[PDB]
Amino acid sequence: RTPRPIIFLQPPWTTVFQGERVTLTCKGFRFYSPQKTKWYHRYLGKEILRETPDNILEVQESGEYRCQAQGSPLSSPVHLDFSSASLILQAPLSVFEGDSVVLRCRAKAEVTLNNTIYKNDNVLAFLNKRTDFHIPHACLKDNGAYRCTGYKESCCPVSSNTVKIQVQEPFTRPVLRASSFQPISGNPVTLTCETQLSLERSDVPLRFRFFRDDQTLGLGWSLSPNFQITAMWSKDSGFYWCKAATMPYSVISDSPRSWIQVQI
Amino acid sequence: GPSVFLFPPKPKDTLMISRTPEVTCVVVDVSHEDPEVKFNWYVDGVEVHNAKTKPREEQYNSTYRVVSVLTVCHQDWLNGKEYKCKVSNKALPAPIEKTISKAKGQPREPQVYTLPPSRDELTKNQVSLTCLVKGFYPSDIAVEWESNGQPENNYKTTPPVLDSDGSFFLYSKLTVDKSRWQQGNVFSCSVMHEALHNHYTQKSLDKS
Amino acid sequence: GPSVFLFPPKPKDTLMISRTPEVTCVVVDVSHEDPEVKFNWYVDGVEVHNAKTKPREEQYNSTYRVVSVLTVCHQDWLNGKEYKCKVSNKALPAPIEKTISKAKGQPREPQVYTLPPSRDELTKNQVSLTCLVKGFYPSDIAVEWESNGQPENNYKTTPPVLDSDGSFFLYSKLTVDKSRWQQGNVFSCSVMHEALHNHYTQKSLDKS
Amino acid sequence: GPSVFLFPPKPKDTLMISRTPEVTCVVVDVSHEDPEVKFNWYVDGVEVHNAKTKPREEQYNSTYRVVSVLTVCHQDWLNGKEYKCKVSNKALPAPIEKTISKAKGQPREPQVYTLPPSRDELTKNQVSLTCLVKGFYPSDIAVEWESNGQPENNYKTTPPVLDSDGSFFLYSKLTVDKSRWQQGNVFSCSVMHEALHNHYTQKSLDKST
Amino acid sequence: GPSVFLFPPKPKDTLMISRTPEVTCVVVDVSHEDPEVKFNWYVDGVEVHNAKTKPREEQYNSTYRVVSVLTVCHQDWLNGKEYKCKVSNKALPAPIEKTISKAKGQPREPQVYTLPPSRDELTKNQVSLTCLVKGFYPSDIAVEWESNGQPENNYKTTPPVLDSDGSFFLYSKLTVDKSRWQQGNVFSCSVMHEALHNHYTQKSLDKST
Ligand SMILES: *[C@@H]1O[C@H](CO[C@@H]2O[C@@H](C)[C@@H](O)[C@@H](O)[C@@H]2O)[C@@H](O[C@@H]2O[C@H](CO)[C@@H](O[C@@H]3O[C@H](CO[C@H]4O[C@H](CO)[C@@H](O)[C@H](O)[C@@H]4O[C@@H]4O[C@H](CO)[C@@H](O)[C@H](O)[C@H]4NC(C)=O)[C@@H](O)[C@H](O)[C@@H]3O)[C@H](O)[C@H]2NC(C)=O)[C@H](O)[C@H]1NC(C)=O
């Protein structure tokens, strides 16, 4: 349905300066492509094709980029931006939960005074002699249009570009499937905590913890998304659910509690 | 000469937007001399290529069965788009073309009433909530159960029984633990029928 | 040639001593040239001569149909007596014998619960009294509806649906007038199943 | 140079199987010297000819406006499929392309609460039933009202408003006659969001609640 | 080609005496070669130098933006005084004049109704009270909540929505802890509008409705 390769910025700032260069990596985990990537660069009524024998594409021009792996559809647009302006707000291309978003209020080789990050056209934070804004844990509250403003030496208070920080879920909210929600007593019923991991974050393993009504099952977390119960009796017929977590246990999503009944 | 059969999509698939309705064309009794079958599908006479062909599987009578399924979405199936399953075979002197569409007829709106469990069952270990759905035509219906926005999985729906006045009626018994019922939890009955307002009707029922 | 078929007696026929259970061994496709269908009935391999043979009838496919009905005892049926129809015809090189008997599954007692109509249905002109007969095995059951000791025929009973635990459950919707329902009349859901006490359980419901 | 604006399908049309979701790309400031505009529709990179182009409309400022409607089905739109509208004109130095798709982000199940009218509204001739719909993402929701299975057209719905959590919240005011409220009548708030189970929730509200 | 925009004072600052209303004259598209803009601020017909022109601000697109904010008294804005700014720039042959004033229409008194949380929401950690403000005109209103004479800053107000009567309505939802709600705390929804008596109306709302 969605075999779209993802382009990864390096540095992750989608907006950079004129002399700087960024490397665009057409990362394909499933349906991998170490080479032969057809880049559909487009700036202004352009369909420029620049094929490279590697997975990287070092560029220094603005526009909208995408890559096309072998046997794979076109990639999502990447709105690169190279600015000659005196102040820009560098933001990561993709923001996921649990990330450390660093919205840099970086000027063009100048120490801009009185920086102030505006979220949704109102003051959010103040950076006195500082540039790097920091969100320690990105969530849905950290959505909107950010834009930093700062006084120059004596020329002009300069407003930077607007970057839309949209936070996407690293994995879909888990749903606890089971082999049967009404297992006869003495039958093995396998729990399943499926989470459709986003293709941006697919190399990160997931740890699943399966629960009874309020008592955890097994020994903490486990990389296996299937918790097999050899034989469940009538006692343990309660609200079963699961918790899907990333490898640092930073962002944890709780599955809806599906009731499992035991038939006898 | 292999035989051609057609199966319409199930009502649940065509009545829930969360699911994808799939129309299944089944070709059986395929001779091993000419097992290659080419499938063509029509949407109001306009050729389409969204159909995918499943791998053939041998039958017990030394024949082959190949099934072609066309991806359809609900709006085109509901208004009555004519779908033609043309089966091309060399053994058959001519290809077999047959016409399928939604069964045309007057729709009657279901009257969803949800009934609390009998007081005789309140002393049992498991109450049985009920969802009578009567007076609906045709029988293409889907009934589900919900609790706090999540589907219950211990419900069984009786087949649609023809009523006296030519309509249909059925039930939906959800077996809920008596403890959950006695804390005032809300259990809703979801009915997805063509004749409804938005093809949906959700009638909740609590301890009240 | 002729075909031999054997059918069990009706579920209400055997469980009530007031009704007469009958086993029908129906023979179809009887040739006109050889219409003499010989009927012999064996009760656990013991020949009996109390059976009744109906006259033949003309069929739509230019054949004949001869039916033999044998009156059986309820004790002689539910205890597990193997019945046999010996069908011999001049078109049949050998006699074709069909066998029927009581289903040997383990009985499970039904739990009859009677549900009053919902408050939503009261706004309608005809309420629908429902009777849930759940947790019964096998499917050989009969449900009636008697008001003030007199059975009435306006109800519809859903086919027995398999429950989650392997038993069966059904429903019976009786549509009575709203004014008649709230006039104070009492209605009963009579259940005739083999696993009950005396093969009978009747539950009443009213406005209260 | 003429401009092209692309408009996503309304949230109502993308969630009901009984509704046709359409996406429109209109063009403004069309010069009368070149009144011929060729429309090419692309869905996920492949050309689709299902679109029907409406006739041109005359404007007040001596320009022309052309609207092209292409009808999709909801499973394609809800999966995040891209949509590109191609406009070709003689006066245009280059064709203008715009891309629209469903806004990405974490879904959140709205919590539908129906609030009965205040005690100070029963002195009025008409009561104002309320359906608070809080905690959903994105702001693609359709909220309706219905009594006894029939639609109600006397409701006005506020636009989604961002809460503190970042999820939106919405309000729906249905104005009904006080006679129809003081009796036994059940008005249900029909909430359709992409995050709810079966994309639907129906919260009943009557005098007893 | 510089352009100017006149923005009316936000309705919250034009009604409370505590805060001050300010009519802003913002210019944009001011190139480097012609960056000098002088604002001639007029109250009704005369020129008043009470304005405080903020310095030029260089946007990201290398075009400047000069904002001249003139503070005004509520007694003049609420009486429909026509504020205008004359922007002088080297691009336009003549100075550009933009004129705005109060929304002129028959004022209608809002009907504030406070709605307690639904019983379904009385199970969550935080309940959300509601303040339906109905049937006012114009859409220049301020809604602020209070608990014990001290303001509560956990509310979000929907923008005014046009009704069938021609008036407006909005809902102000304030979220508080259920612990505070169950003790019987009083939450009064203060509403400031020009049509109300003394431009104020509080509707108290506690656990006993
Ligand atoms: C060059 O950039 C400037 C500045 O634009 C900013 O930076 C660029 C790079 C982008 O990121 C922009 O998105 C970003 O805004 C552009 O100037 C903009 O020009 C347009 C049209 O010329 C103006 O829109 C028009 O004005 C209003 C809407 O303006 C209100 O709402 C905006 C958000 O939608 C705010 O940003 C505005 O400040 C304004 O908000 C009001 O502000 C006053 C002042 O305090 C308050 O008193 C009001 O209460 C407040 N109102 C609200 C709703 O909060 C509208 O009539 C209509 O949409 C007009 O199109 C933009 O206002 C203007 N932006 C700014 C910040 O001034 C230039 O157009 C760019 N040059 C080129 C060549 O494109």
Ligand SMILES: *[C@@H]1O[C@H](CO)[C@@H](O[C@@H]2O[C@H](CO)[C@@H](O[C@@H]3O[C@H](CO[C@H]4O[C@H](CO)[C@@H](O)[C@H](O)[C@@H]4O[C@@H]4O[C@H](CO)[C@@H](O)[C@H](O)[C@H]4NC(C)=O)[C@@H](O)[C@H](O)[C@@H]3O)[C@H](O)[C@H]2NC(C)=O)[C@H](O)[C@H]1NC(C)=O
């Ligand atoms: C000569 O006069 C014409 C008048 O047609 C002017 O065209 C107008 O240009 C302006 C400026 O670019 C443009 O305003 C932007 O439009 C977008 C939003 O559009 C929606 O609102 C306008 C209201 O006028 C409707 O016309 C649109 O169709 C949109 O309304 C609804 O939009 C939703 C999605 O949001 C869509 O689903 C609905 O179908 C649609 N409703 C209908 C009935 O179609 C935004 O980009 C932006 O916010 C601006 O408002 C305006 O739309 C143009 N008018 C049109 C297309 O009719 C010319 O500019 C003018 N020429 C000169 C030189 O002055």
Ligand SMILES: *[C@@H]1O[C@H](CO)[C@@H](O)[C@H](O)[C@H]1NC(C)=O
């Ligand atoms: C910079 O910020 C400081 C601290 O808020 C403030 O006092 C000062 O006036 C600002 N300087 C300018 C030039 O705006």
